[PDB]
Amino acid sequence: QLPYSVTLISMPATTEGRRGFSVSVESASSNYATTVQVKEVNRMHISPNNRNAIHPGDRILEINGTPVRTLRVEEVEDAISQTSQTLQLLIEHDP
């Protein structure tokens, strides 16, 4: 009924604490990330090209090409917080 949009972005390496967003990770079974949802966004910490590509309520489907349901909760958060690494994200936009 409503549009379903998916965006692939690449976030360049930055300094510690400045990835530009946080997540809420729900882990239904075991310690795997079932769903990864963007919680907060600091637009000024995001490069101009990606500043309008990630919003609160968006869900992260894949991190650097890996579906998040196969990652442990710590691996998801490590990837976001390891600002020395380029971070590729597959983002499902919320309608």
Numbering used by the authors: 145 to 239
Source paper text:
LIM domain kinases (LIMK) are important regulators of actin cytoskeletal remodeling. These protein kinases phosphorylate the actin depolymerizing factor cofilin to suppress filament severing, and are key nodes between Rho GTPase cascades and actin. LIMKs across species have a common architecture, with two N-terminal tandem-zinc finger LIM domains followed by a PDZ domain, a predicted unstructured region enriched in serine, proline and glycine residues, and a C-terminal kinase domain. The LIMK PDZ domain is unusual however in that it does not interact tightly with carboxy-terminal peptides.
